[PDB]
Amino acid sequence: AVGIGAVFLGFLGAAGSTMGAASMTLTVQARNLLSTVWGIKQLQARVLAVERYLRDQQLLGIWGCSGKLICCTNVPWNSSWSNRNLSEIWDNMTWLQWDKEISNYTQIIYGLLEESQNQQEKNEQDLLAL
Amino acid sequence: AVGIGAVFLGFLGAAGSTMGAASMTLTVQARNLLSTVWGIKQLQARVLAVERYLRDQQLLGIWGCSGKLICCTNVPWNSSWSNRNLSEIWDNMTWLQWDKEISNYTQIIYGLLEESQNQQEKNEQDLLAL
Amino acid sequence: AENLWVTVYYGVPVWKDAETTLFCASDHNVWATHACVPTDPNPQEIHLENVTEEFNMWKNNMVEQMHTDIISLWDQSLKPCVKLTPLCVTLQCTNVTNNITDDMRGELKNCSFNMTTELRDKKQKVYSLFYRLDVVQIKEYRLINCNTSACTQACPKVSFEPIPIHYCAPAGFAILKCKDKKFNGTGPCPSVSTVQCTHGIKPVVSTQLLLNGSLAEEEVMIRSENITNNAKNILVQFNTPVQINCTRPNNNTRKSIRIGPGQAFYATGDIIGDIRQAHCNVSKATWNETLGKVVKQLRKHFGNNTIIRFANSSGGDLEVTTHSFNCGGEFFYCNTSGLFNSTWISNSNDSITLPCRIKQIINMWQRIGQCMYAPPIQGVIRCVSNITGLILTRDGGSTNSTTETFRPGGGDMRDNWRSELYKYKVVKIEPLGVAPTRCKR
Amino acid sequence: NPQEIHLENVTEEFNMWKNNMVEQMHTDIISLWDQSLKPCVKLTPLCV
Amino acid sequence: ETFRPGGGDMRDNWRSELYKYKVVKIEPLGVAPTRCKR
Amino acid sequence: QKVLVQSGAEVKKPGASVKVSCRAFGYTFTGNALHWVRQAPGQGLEWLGWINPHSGDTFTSQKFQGRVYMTRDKSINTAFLDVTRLTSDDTGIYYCARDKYYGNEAVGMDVWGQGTSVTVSS
Amino acid sequence: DIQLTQSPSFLSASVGDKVTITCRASQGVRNELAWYQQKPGKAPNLLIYYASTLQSGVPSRFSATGSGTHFTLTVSSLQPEDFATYFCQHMSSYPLTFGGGTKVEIK
Ligand SMILES: *[C@@H]1O[C@H](CO)[C@@H](O[C@@H]2O[C@H](CO)[C@@H](O[C@@H]3O[C@H](CO)[C@@H](O)[C@H](O[C@H]4O[C@H](CO)[C@@H](O)[C@H](O)[C@@H]4O[C@H]4O[C@H](CO)[C@@H](O)[C@H](O)[C@@H]4O)[C@@H]3O)[C@H](O)[C@H]2NC(C)=O)[C@H](O)[C@H]1NC(C)=O
Ligand SMILES: *[C@@H]1O[C@H](CO)[C@@H](O[C@@H]2O[C@H](CO)[C@@H](O[C@@H]3O[C@H](CO)[C@@H](O)[C@H](O)[C@@H]3O)[C@H](O)[C@H]2NC(C)=O)[C@H](O)[C@H]1NC(C)=O
Ligand SMILES: *[C@@H]1O[C@H](CO)[C@@H](O[C@@H]2O[C@H](CO)[C@@H](O[C@@H]3O[C@H](CO)[C@@H](O)[C@H](O)[C@@H]3O)[C@H](O)[C@H]2NC(C)=O)[C@H](O)[C@H]1NC(C)=O
Ligand SMILES: *[C@@H]1O[C@H](CO)[C@@H](O[C@@H]2O[C@H](CO)[C@@H](O)[C@H](O)[C@H]2NC(C)=O)[C@H](O)[C@H]1NC(C)=O
Ligand SMILES: *[C@@H]1O[C@H](CO)[C@@H](O[C@@H]2O[C@H](CO)[C@@H](O)[C@H](O)[C@H]2NC(C)=O)[C@H](O)[C@H]1NC(C)=O
Ligand SMILES: *[C@@H]1O[C@H](CO)[C@@H](O[C@@H]2O[C@H](CO)[C@@H](O)[C@H](O)[C@H]2NC(C)=O)[C@H](O)[C@H]1NC(C)=O
Ligand SMILES: *[C@@H]1O[C@H](CO)[C@@H](O[C@@H]2O[C@H](CO)[C@@H](O)[C@H](O)[C@H]2NC(C)=O)[C@H](O)[C@H]1NC(C)=O
Ligand SMILES: *[C@@H]1O[C@H](CO)[C@@H](O[C@@H]2O[C@H](CO)[C@@H](O)[C@H](O)[C@H]2NC(C)=O)[C@H](O)[C@H]1NC(C)=O
Ligand SMILES: *[C@@H]1O[C@H](CO)[C@@H](O[C@@H]2O[C@H](CO)[C@@H](O)[C@H](O)[C@H]2NC(C)=O)[C@H](O)[C@H]1NC(C)=O
Ligand SMILES: *[C@@H]1O[C@H](CO)[C@@H](O[C@@H]2O[C@H](CO)[C@@H](O)[C@H](O)[C@H]2NC(C)=O)[C@H](O)[C@H]1NC(C)=O
Ligand SMILES: *[C@@H]1O[C@H](CO)[C@@H](O[C@@H]2O[C@H](CO)[C@@H](O)[C@H](O)[C@H]2NC(C)=O)[C@H](O)[C@H]1NC(C)=O
Ligand SMILES: *[C@@H]1O[C@H](CO)[C@@H](O)[C@H](O)[C@H]1NC(C)=O
Ligand SMILES: *[C@@H]1O[C@H](CO)[C@@H](O)[C@H](O)[C@H]1NC(C)=O
Ligand SMILES: *[C@@H]1O[C@H](CO)[C@@H](O)[C@H](O)[C@H]1NC(C)=O
Ligand SMILES: *[C@@H]1O[C@H](CO)[C@@H](O)[C@H](O)[C@H]1NC(C)=O
Ligand SMILES: *[C@@H]1O[C@H](CO)[C@@H](O)[C@H](O)[C@H]1NC(C)=O
């Protein structure tokens, strides 16, 4: 058909869209992660929000994904995680369902990205030493 | 004439220098952005300062300018913003006057850098998929 | 043809007018420095070339924050102190007439009263000397505050002497300082610097006269928000201080009365020797030529052939109609009628003595229902201070007459704080900038 | 299951008499004692 | 040599349990010579 | 507001050493290169050298090399000129002068010290 | 060492006259020349820098011209606080040198 360009679905408007479509709105979710007893619970809330944002940023950065919203890696896809070859992930499912499907497979991947990034840093060190 | 090298004008010493000259002292401003009722207002102040520093860092990082102090971009200069070709910006004006001149033109540019960076991330994803 | 692209610069020297919470720095006392950061032994001032900055002392939020800070420090220094609820009893008072002068008649009351003891079932008949200003007749009297609120006795170990306090901006903020002499507080300052903390400002509480403050380096400075509005206070800053010597000459005896378990009330026992009036001395010639300076600087605003007249305070509370201040724990209220009494037409060793009255029941800030009782000070007390400025109020001023009349003002301590913070402002750094450049990513 | 990491080859300087842990713990114990007594009866009438 | 029971200050009671502990802050940044050039 | 204040006058014997101090007020000390000059009684000015107060680098006029030393302390915003092996020809007024220093190069000595008389005589 | 030579060495002129003082350099100094004024027993003052730019806080009667080796300092209308010693100083190459000096005195 004819079109008139891209539209804006809001903060979490792509939560019901496919993973491929929802991957086009990452900055929209990214920006809204940062912003005498009720000056204390409020301050604890703000500190917790900052702490979780920084934990996510550190976790990205120790993978070599610092400053990126989409970051392809060197770690291969162990098929013991998911056997769905691609046509039924990015065009037929949403990120909530994918997270339901791999919340049982997360931390091992994070540690692997960590050790692969450290390997990369040392190998680049050796390469620049020549 | 003869010179004996660069000098140090202090925290905001280049505020009255030209934009080109003041662009040589960016780190100087960069470092000083981070550092039972007056343990609360103090803590609110510290949390606020951290929050604004992190907001600026996130805003840089969702443009592809993460970890940089000067970051040239893919977004062209829409001349509806400013018509001064270059000799009357970098050698004849200071950053305070420039910010006076474009505080009315800021947020649109930020959103454009955002969407351009996401476009770049996806295009790099497609390139590495080959 | 231009081929220009957006370029992002981080760390740009740009700032905006901002309001934030400053913090305290300093090198038993009310102005608690046990919650103040140590001051840097070598503070760093960055002199900003070519920076012309907009200043306005009358909208400075630093003044409002400092007022709040001073009030809070005063409040928290009185919290762990004796509440004098038992003192609201009937007082049987007589006149103190043993070795009093003619100007101290009826000024002191010898009041006997029943008081609680450390044991809940026992009473003690005690007596104290009270000031005429502190008691109201019901021979039977009561303390002035007893139909408004109970009074908190100041803890005798806490000192009232001002300590300099430095105000410092947090991260991401800067304090801009106007180095311009002749600066009248409003408009463009072309000589600007950046400081991490302000200079040591002493919280000197006083009315009608600014004491122990900063001096102008060039000449007497007149500063008003709107000089043609007679509802605006004029702040005068002296270039040379005027020495004022204030004494309470009575040899006061303090006795301690146990009013409860671990609770002492400090009564005035008996004055050892002659009873005579507290007062202040100002050099007559120094004050005269200082007023000449003030007049010469006021003519610049109110005409060159105008008559400049200084007169008494109009009226109101004892706090505002007198030069009220604190001299080593005692609270003086001095009649500044010999100071502001003169006319000026365009064309030795003696001194002016200002009689003063002492009070013990104090309402510091313009608040009602929150009062402080000052314990008596043992012995004679004497202090020497610098008058470094004035708070004046112009009288009427319709076009009917060519005489301008000025009267001492005060009461609101924000004008006292504004006389020290007039050359400071707070800004927030805006490091992000976008500019055209030839690069493409 | 608290985790103790045994540091091989590490030799460390210890001084029990300048330990600030002790001072903080003293403060904590005193504060806990003080705040456990705050919502309790003040026996002012008993001074008879 | 004569020894008598003491006490009063509870900091000695806390010191008898914390004698084998200390607190340190981690300094993660380091700089060293290596053959690379950026 | 920019001022340079120097130490007091000095009277030394030949072959001695003299230390002229110069402290800066009203401007950032590390923001301008600082010259040292001397004038003999009734003669013209003779430029000794200059120092970068930020880095500590110095340049001495070649005929003074190895005899005069320039140093600075930033904690007190001061520069020191050490003239060693004094002779009667060294008698004169010593000035420290701030340079305008536009573009990190000498432009002109806009702020001057009050001068320090150093007299060398047996 | 580069040599700066000034003409006159001594001059007498009255208030309201114009004075032109010439400084010549043995080698080329493009615009790296500064003109200073000194008065008895006092530190000099920067009058001109870049050989034609007037120092901030100097009266407009002072002017300078010339590039390379020849420079002229002109005061259009003399004034009784302008009678003093004048120096020309280059900073193109080391050593920085000052001129011999011109003493202007009232007639
Ligand atoms: C403007 O500045 C000037 C100069 O800074 C101020 O004048 C000075 O004021 C201070 C404080 O008033 C004064 O210091 C006192 O000097 C007395 C004489 O030496 C001392 O007796 C007195 O010490 C007593 O009070 C202290 C607290 O104020 C206690 O810490 C101290 O232990 C003393 O207290 C004992 O003695 C008293 C009396 O018996 C008893 O009540 C106590 O319980 C305790 O037993 C102070 O040190 C200076 O001497 C003044 N200097 C001059 C030159 O005058 C002036 O006040 C300022 N003006 C304003 C408006 O603030
Ligand atoms: C919410 O879910 C519905 C489906 O349950 C989404 O609608 C579906 O959108 C896709 C693509 O946007 C449509 O696919 C299209 O199919 C036609 C013909 O098959 C083809 O020509 C197109 O190229 C495209 O592939 C699909 O038909 C459509 N489903 C239905 C029933 O209409 C909807 O987009 C989801 N909402 C959001 C906000 O994501
Ligand atoms: C504060 O502002 C003043 C004046 O705007 C600045 O002085 C100016 O500095 C520039 C260079 O920084 C000078 O440009 C120079 O011009 C000469 C001849 O015109 C040329 O040879 C040089 O190569 C250079 O281009 C300019 O002349 C000068 N202005 C004046 C009146 O002297 C000053 O640098 C600013 N200060 C700060 C700290 O930014
Ligand atoms: C205030 O009043 C009290 C009580 O009337 C006076 O104290 C008495 O003093 C006399 C000597 O002058 C003694 O003989 C009495 O025994 C005292 N009575 C008590 C109850 O102590 C006190 O002198 C008076 N003070 C003043 C300044 O008038
Ligand atoms: C202290 O209390 C006593 C007793 O409570 C007061 O003495 C009484 O005074 C009333 C008059 O108001 C008499 O009618 C009683 O007969 C008195 N009783 C006794 C035992 O004397 C005394 O006046 C109080 N003192 C003060 C200074 O208020
Ligand atoms: C009253 O004013 C005089 C003069 O300003 C003060 O004396 C000065 O004190 C400072 C200390 O900060 C010295 O640096 C000056 O040299 C002194 N000048 C003179 C002329 O003595 C004096 O300290 C002030 N007194 C009070 C109580 O504030
Ligand atoms: C200073 O304050 C006066 C207020 O008295 C301002 O002038 C008055 O403005 C009202 C507004 O309607 C007029 O009715 C009065 O007639 C004005 N007064 C006079 C004397 O004309 C004045 O504008 C203020 N100045 C500034 C600079 O704001
Ligand atoms: C204020 O001035 C009066 C003088 O009018 C002083 O009174 C003198 O005080 C001295 C004390 O040394 C006595 O020797 C004189 O005899 C007194 N003369 C008179 C006429 O009273 C008073 O002491 C001064 N007070 C202060 C605080 O300076
Ligand atoms: C205020 O008190 C000071 C002393 O505290 C007085 O200073 C004295 O002034 C006389 C001149 O009459 C000198 O002879 C003394 O040497 C000074 N004493 C000191 C310690 O400096 C001052 O005169 C008093 N001022 C007034 C107005 O009474
Ligand atoms: C300013 O001076 C006037 C007169 O010089 C004072 O007025 C006096 O006030 C008292 C108080 O009741 C009266 O007893 C007098 O009779 C008044 N005098 C005259 C001449 O009317 C006025 O009190 C002074 N101002 C202040 C604030 O004290
Ligand atoms: C402030 O001082 C003036 C001057 O002494 C007082 O005015 C005097 O008041 C008395 C009344 O007690 C009269 O007898 C005098 O004639 C008045 N003198 C003058 C010159 O007016 C004034 O009352 C004092 N202020 C207060 C509030 O008491
Ligand atoms: C106390 O003295 C004043 C003034 O001398 C007088 O008016 C008052 O009536 C006296 N009160 C007495 C004696 O109770
Ligand atoms: C307290 O009493 C005084 C004088 O008796 C009176 O002026 C004041 O209004 C009273 N205050 C209240 C709150 O009743
Ligand atoms: C003095 O204050 C007035 C207030 O309107 C202002 O206009 C003026 O600019 C100030 N003085 C100077 C020299 O700026
Ligand atoms: C005050 O009285 C006490 C006790 O009578 C005495 O020791 C002291 O010297 C007196 N002080 C003065 C200043 O007269
Ligand atoms: C005010 O000045 C007049 C002189 O005109 C004098 O008579 C009067 O006593 C003075 N008042 C005071 C309180 O000094």
Residue numbers in the entry:
A (entry chain D), B (entry chain B): 512 to 546, 569 to 663
C (entry chain A): 31 to 57, 66 to 141, 150 to 184, 189 to 309, 312 to 321, 321A, 322 to 398, 410 to 503
D (entry chain E): 80 to 127
E (entry chain E): 466 to 503
F (entry chain G): 1 to 52, 52A, 53 to 82, 82A, 82B, 82C, 83 to 100, 100A, ...
G (entry chain H): 1 to 107
From the paper:
Rational combinations of these top single-mutant variants further improved neutralization breadth, with a maximum 85% breadth on the 20-virus panel achieved for VH_E2K_T59F (also referred to as VRC34.01-Combo1, Kabat numbering VH_E2K_T59F). To determine the structural basis of increased breadth from Combo1’s E2K and T59F mutations, we determined the co-crystal structure of Combo1 Fab in complex with fusion peptide FP8_v1 (AVGIGAVF) and the cryo-EM structure of Combo1 Fab with the BG505 DS-SOSIP trimer. B CryoEM structure of BG505 DS-SOSIP HIV trimer in complex with the VRC34.01_Combo1 Fab. More specifically, the Combo1 K2HC mutation contributed to increased HIV trimer affinity by removing electrostatic repulsion between template E2HC and E87gp120. The K2HC substitution in Combo1 and mm28 converted this residue to a positive charge and became attractive to the negatively charged E87 in gp120, which reduced the energy 0.76 (Combo1) and 1.09 kcal/mol (mm28) compared to the VRC34.01 template, which tightened and stabilized the binding between the antibody and trimer (first column). Structural comparisons of the template VRC34.01 to the top two engineered variants VRC34.01_Combo1 and VRC34.01_mm28 demonstrated that improved antibodies still bound to FP and Env much like the template antibody, relying primarily on heavy chain interactions with both gp120 and gp41 for virus recognition, with improved antibodies binding more surface area at the FP interface. D 208-virus panel data revealed enhanced breadth for Combo1 (VH_E2K_T59F) to 68% of all strains, with strong neutralization of FP_v1 strains (98%), moderate neutralization of FP_Thai strains (61%), and gain-of-function for neutralization of FP_v3 and FP_v4 strains that were not neutralized at all by VRC34.01 (43% and 11%, respectively).
